[PDB]
Chain length 232, copies 2
């Protein structure tokens, strides 16, 4: 058969490679197709049946035709070059961060709204000098010295990114949730359910068989609010 996934840079690059490896090893003869686009593009491709699944933090919520299901919870990091002034602070504050030029996601990408919320509630105006679409660009301009990076935690690793200093910022921002969606009325074949469960182990077949019944977002929220999510 065929498995078709539309997703974003964040997931394609940091969340999916090991599950895609595993899927391909387990299902050598399923025709895999993947596509990367903006959250609106990929969400609408899943919503109208162009592909099986959309995976992203953003836009999925806006399409009522989607059975959307939470996969994991995450929060942000601040990344700066070695010896940068923010590395000298005992603890990071929103006020210290707001005094720096910021390199972070464009509006509407990868939980950016939570950052704006945190700044506005304290009456702070971030000086955002680079609005980027992905964390690879963010990291190259942090490296060259353009300013302070604010990225999703799964986009940075203390060993892989040793040339940068990672400061945890999850106490300054509300966390975000990465979700998976498929069009309501889709028949979930076995290998599809195994992919979903590889990506999000709590989405067992027992739970899937309840999720396909949810007629609208209220019923999904009733099904999932009780459930604990992995944190990355």
């Amino acid at each position: 058969g065929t498995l078709s996934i539309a997703t974003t840079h964040t997931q394609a690059r940091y969340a999916l490679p090991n599950v895609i490896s595993g899927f391909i090893k387990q299902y050598p003869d399923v025709s895999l197709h993947m596509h990367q686009g903006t959250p609106m593009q990929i969400a609408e491709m899943a919503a109208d049946g162009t592909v099986d699944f959309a995976i992203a933090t953003e836009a999925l919520e806006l399409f009522g035709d989607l059975i959307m299901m939470p996969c994991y919870r995450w929060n942000r990091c601040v990344i700066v070059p070695h010896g940068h002034p923010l590395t000298k602070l005992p603890k990071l504050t929103l006020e210290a961060l707001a005094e720096q030029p910021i390199v972070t996601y464009v509006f509407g990408f990868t939980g950016r709204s939570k950052l704006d919320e945190a700044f506005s509630q304290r009456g702070l105006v971030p000086k955002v000098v680079f609005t980027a679409a992905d964390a690879d660009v963010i990291k190259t301009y942090v490296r060259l010295g353009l300013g302070v990076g604010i990225v999703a935690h799964m986009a940075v690793d203390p060993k892989l990114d040793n040339d940068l200093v990672i400061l945890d910022a999850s106490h300054l921002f509300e966390s975000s949730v990465t979700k998976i969606g498929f069009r309501r009325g889709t028949f979930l074949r076995g290998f599809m359910c195994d992919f979903i469960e590889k990506f999000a182990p709590h989405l067992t077949r027992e739970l899937l068989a309840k999720a396909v019944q949810c007629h609208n977002k209220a019923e999904l929220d009733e099904l999932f609010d009780g459930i604990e999510l992995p944190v990355y």
Copy 2:
């Protein structure tokens, strides 16, 4: 003053970092702002004056309000893991590529149309299993074993990307040209011209002072056809 640039992953990540570093050191008190988006959005941000300059291979040609200028010429390479069968070929052919799974850019991004043209001219249908928006994703799924990558030559580095084999494909595809555009009627301040000239040394102030006069694409083409571009 302020210098404001909207560009793509390709340029932000492979063509601009050294010129942006140089610009920052030369003009510490110019307020630099950058934005990364799809070629259509960044082209229209330049056209309506939201930013000074757009830099990309695609879409700029569609905005008549833009003074568009060629910056450099480039072509594609094929990237595969070590020991992949295509490395055994003396020289790469389109037929050898067409029997492989391909990982490359989505339609309308980064010269993909030249790939589509080359294949269709031979009655070959590429099996594109991953349509990606950027070369960072492309390279991770080539590394993961998903198939053969086709990327802009500047998206891969023989030293940095030591784990991949780069095979020249420039005899199989027509070359692409990266352009810079700004809205007609923009006043080019000194630091703007110094930025442009760092990005494209043939665009000297003499040449800029002729380009601002070109009322349309025909006059631009008459001005620029004579000039040779650096190749990356």
